Curated annotation (Swiss-Prot), chain A:
Protein name, as recorded: DNA-directed RNA polymerase subunit beta
Role this protein plays: DNA-dependent RNA polymerase catalyzes the transcription of DNA into RNA using the four ribonucleoside triphosphates as substrates.
Top-level taxon of origin: Bacteria
Subunit structure: The RNAP catalytic core consists of 2 alpha, 1 beta, 1 beta' and 1 omega subunit. When a sigma factor is associated with the core the holoenzyme is formed, which can initiate transcription.
Organism field: Escherichia coli O157:H7
Family as reported in the entry's similarity comment: Belongs to the RNA polymerase beta chain family.
UniProtKB/Swiss-Prot annotation, chain B:
UniProt free text on domains: The N-terminal domain interacts with RNAP and the C-terminal domain binds either to Rho or to RpsJ (NusE). These domains are separated by a flexible linker.
Gene: nusG
One example of a Gene Ontology biological process annotation: transcription elongation-coupled chromatin remodeling
Full-sequence range covered: 1 to 123 of 181
Annotated TM spans: none
Protein name in the entry: Transcription termination/antitermination protein NusG
Curated annotation (Swiss-Prot), chain C:
Provenance organism: Escherichia coli O157:H7
Primary role: DNA-dependent RNA polymerase catalyzes the transcription of DNA into RNA using the four ribonucleoside triphosphates as substrates.
Top-level division of the source organism's lineage: Bacteria
Family: Belongs to the RNA polymerase beta' chain family.
Name of this protein: DNA-directed RNA polymerase subunit beta'
Residues of the full protein shown: 253 to 302 of 1407
UniProtKB/Swiss-Prot annotation, chain D:
Assembly: The RNAP catalytic core consists of 2 alpha, 1 beta, 1 beta' and 1 omega subunit. When a sigma factor is associated with the core the holoenzyme is formed, which can initiate transcription.
Purpose: DNA-dependent RNA polymerase catalyzes the transcription of DNA into RNA using the four ribonucleoside triphosphates as substrates.
Membrane-crossing residue ranges in chain numbering: none
Family: Belongs to the RNA polymerase beta' chain family.
Residues of the full protein shown: 102 to 151 of 1407
Disulfide bridge map: none
Descriptive protein name: DNA-directed RNA polymerase subunit beta'
Domain of life: Bacteria
Amino acid sequence: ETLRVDPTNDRLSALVEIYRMMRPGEPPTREAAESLFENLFFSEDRYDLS
Amino acid sequence: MSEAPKKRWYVVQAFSGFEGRVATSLREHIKLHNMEDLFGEVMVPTEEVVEIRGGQRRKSERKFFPGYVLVQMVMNDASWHLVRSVPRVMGFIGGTSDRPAPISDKEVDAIMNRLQQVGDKPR
Amino acid sequence: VPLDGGRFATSDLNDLYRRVINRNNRLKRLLDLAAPDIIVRNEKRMLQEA
Amino acid sequence: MGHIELASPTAHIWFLKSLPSRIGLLLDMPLRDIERVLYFESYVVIEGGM
RNA sequence: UCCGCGGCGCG
DNA sequence: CTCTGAATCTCTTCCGACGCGCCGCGGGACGTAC
DNA sequence: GTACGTCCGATCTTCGGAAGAGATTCAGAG
């Protein structure tokens, strides 16, 4: 049911929504979206567990 | 691109007292990425009123509006990202945030004519 | 209050009034030079926020 | 007491963004649209006529 | 100099 | 069909005891000249 | 080193409890 309620079924579209709700007002281009996503949980500089 | 639209001026906000280094930084960011066709020229209005005495002497720099600087960007996405990527820059100003609003051409011509007579009383 | 040293303990009311009067003076100066419409709209928004 | 000659009119917060919006329900409007109109994002019509 | 913030303590 | 409508879910605000003693920090930074 | 004019960009993340206003919803007459 969680997948049923999913509004979109595209990885690019998913990056679009995550980029939109990360901070509102910005048009969702793919390059900026992927750069932002790679710098939230997968970048050694702004994210690390001791 | 396929179309040939005029590179009409846009307005981008910057910190007061930091305009010069902001403009220079735009110059090196547009130079290093090597898109000289995408961007034209950047300039901020500046006045040079000279007074012999009374504190400041022989020169005084005044700006009609200090917080804003004009650029020659074109309606795109990568170029706008490059504009916002420069530090000490907040963003575009206009009627709507999603697409920055442009500036009227007739008042651009009027302000250019006004700026064509900056030089007064030489030497 | 002129406390010890060459310093002043400025109340927040003085700072708020100084900001508001500075914005008003800048807008009044800018309105007599026929500034672009977007510029005066943004400055009016800043004054209203202040 | 002194006065500051405001160059442009401004709206009072106490009469705008309280729990009941005075101006909003006086003009039969919600709060979001009047907030958008006052912060220079959208136009409003006066005397539409024909 | 008479104001603000933070901390500790006594009722 | 479609509009209404009463109920329901969601978002925004304000409230949280009273006296006293002591100590320590408070517009700071940033360019522009002198 | 020091007096003086000017000025307000990087990033946050852990309360119940209630009271009220606004958006949603589905229920129904039909």
